[PDB]
Write a protein that binds this ligand. Structure first.
Ligand code: 9FN
Ligand code: 9FN
Ligand code: 9FN
Ligand code: 9FN
Lengths: 156, 156, 157, 157, 157, 157
């Protein structure tokens, strides 16, 4: 009766699409850990990204956020878990991710569960949101309230 | 601490690919129910299919098998659950299934978790196994031992 | 004057279809919605029923009209002095079978096909899936036009 | 020494199919076109007719022969002392369904499958789409082998 | 009255691109080819050069004009009193990445995108692949617009 | 005599690559494995190292030889009196970027490309993913040829 999953990504910044995945993971596993990737060139620092996710998931009691580095399967196994949950928008997303999933299962016995993203956000990604905002487009309805204002300031 | 998922399909007959999904589901949820579809023209009767799955999952203590009919989301919700787990082989599998997943979430709040099939069975399906066996090809390594002998008798 | 044909079986018309109609009507001087009469496979609604449901939902599009069609689509298109088809695409897989036919239509009759990307909210709906779910009791009121939902429940009973 | 089988129902053979035959014949010492018949569902054309259309279009390929068969393709191939199959592909879609059979065929009989990207001009023309379009009067005269076109119109009338 | 913008970097324009321009020009009263420049990364050709190659290949399309721009495409489109974009697609792959931008563009500015399946003969020739192949001496003389080919060889040498 | 070229960077060669080599060597009279020298992007192993690893793993294929290549692939192929390329495909997405290049190669030089479906067991392996996983400590001994694994661990240290 002690199930759990890791939700990995760069989350730079977290989108409503990502939040939806976290909420859906947290509804089906006893414990969910969001793993924010540290990579040796982002718009937000790892601490900022972690902050934004915490503010948006405060209503999820069984969820926590941490930074991670190195092999994802090492992160997962060091926390006593062996499941990863990720959202997918399209069939080519699946193709990219299936390779990694099968590799992760092979080298460390860690399984991967995919969820279809909510339809209203089939077209949102952190990068497209950032690009559009940079050139003055309105992305307020695609980012959580926590994120949107902080994104404004970053470009200002 | 009471999580659970439904694994649906026709399973006519169950393959090593399907068994792999069941095992992977049973490792990550407290309760797993395999739902064998009843449809008003199969090679195996629903009771036969149920039998074959039970024989192959006897080492999975938190798994049970039932027949189901009608809307899948009704089956799931009547058992107090709200998650479906299905395997995917390819990106077009994803496309087909994403539609159904989003519809199921919309009409009944039931979520769907997909897993990538084990690589060794990327090409197995119940139908191709049956077709090849019908024309005399050897499909013994693709079906569980329970199924293979029973499939022989069915064509004999 | 410019123009396009929006073909389909529309049995029944979905909110996704309506989105396509509106986008076409916004960009072409005239739009004809062509409702396929399939003499082999009949569906849930008669073609007259399908036409009235579409007309109800497109009452505010003065440059769009609705007609039944039969047989080769590119003949229907050409006979009306047009040579463009507008269709929705929900995903990459829609693009695939649709692509072959688009190529065929261009080659056999010089008729162009324009695809538009479905609105995200209704991307998973299809006439077939809406009917299947409704038949077995599911709630599809948010996925179907007002012109359709109540009529749909009636045919099921 | 080397050899490949090019299988299909070829009902009728298309320009795409012929492209594949030519490319296979260029790269293997011998090529057998296998016309695979379903003994249960008669197609548009009889086996004799399918073979004659293919032979008429491949008269310039001296290392190619045409034979019919049924049942497991890998048995047809191995009975000829071969163990390669050559087929065309147009899309990622095609590759996905063909990959399954190719992997199965390798698994059960050790038979390899080589895929080739078909020439783009006529790749979209499948046997079924051509028949469908021709059935409803579409002009497919430029889209099919000369050995096929009028024979196809003859059947339809 | 009606109008569409056909956007791209066109570095260089391809036969595929030109197919799209022609089809857009056939179905809309006016068409603007938008040559969108990255003010940070200079391509192979300058803006003047990109425009000249396009104009040379579209001299027979009287309702088409060519203009450069930068930044958000939807701003370029709306500043011209338009709200449609026309682009080509070759694969389900293309449609998937373009669907994202199309949906974003509809969301932020109400601008529609119409996709057309490009003519199959030359669909595989992208600007980048042509440049790559030409850079290493591959014969691309039959695969590119006459306004482009020797200009491209000139740049590479 | 028949023949084909199996091109790649093979940095390092995988069990998937070896499967392709073996299948090619079984069906063509001669096979040349062409190891790309990329003067811009250097990799983990030198080309001489890559060649010796492949030679070790193909020691029992007498009709296969291994050579370095640079520049346009179809020149390498033609210069050796061949006009066929054999490559592996793992999925529908591999088919997509590979398809464009296959078309290009056929058009600019008349060189055919044959694709073979990867064996299922190793479908998720790629040189890049194997290196990435190995760098960060993961266990890839079952995914790589004997000629490679120990040498790989050496370069990482
Ligand atoms: O898993 C890998 O292949 C990998 C290997 C090297 C570096 C990154 C990763 C990686 O995939 C990864 C992605 C996200 C996160 Cl959150 C983490 N993490 O924190 O451990 C890792
Ligand atoms: O869910 C649907 O859309 C549906 C509607 C009508 C009939 C079948 C289904 C269906 O998808 C389904 C599939 C498998 C199983 Cl195991 C069940 N089931 O037992 O409930 C249903
Ligand atoms: O074009 C075809 O291939 C075809 C040939 C026979 C019958 C149907 C069609 C066809 O695709 C088609 C589809 C929708 C409509 Cl709405 C019409 N129509 O009204 O003419 C035709
Ligand atoms: O063909 C190209 O497009 C190309 C042009 C420049 C440089 C590389 C290539 C290329 O694709 C290629 C790839 C692998 C090998 Cl192994 C070779 N080769 O050895 O000649 C070439």
């Amino acid at each position: 009766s002690m199930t759990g999953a890791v939700c990995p990504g760069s989350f730079d910044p977290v989108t409503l699409g990502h939040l939806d995945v976290f909420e859906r993971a947290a509804a089906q596993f006893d414990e969910v850990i969001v793993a924010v990737l540290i990579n040796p060139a982002g718009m937000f620092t790892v601490d900022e990204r972690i902050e934004m996710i915490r503010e948006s998931t405060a209503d999820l009691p069984n969820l926590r956020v941490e930074s991670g580095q190195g092999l994802l399967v090492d992160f997962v196994r060091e926390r006593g878990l062996n499941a990863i949950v990720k959202g997918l928008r399209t069939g080519t997303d699946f193709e990219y991710e299936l390779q990694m999933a099968q590799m992760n299962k092979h080298i460390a016995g860690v399984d991967t569960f995919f969820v279809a993203t909510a339809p209203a956000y089939s077209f949102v990604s952190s990068s497209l949101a950032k690009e559009v905002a940079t050139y003055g487009g309105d992305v307020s309805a695609l980012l959580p309230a926590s994120v949107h204002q902080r994104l404004l300031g970053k470009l200002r």
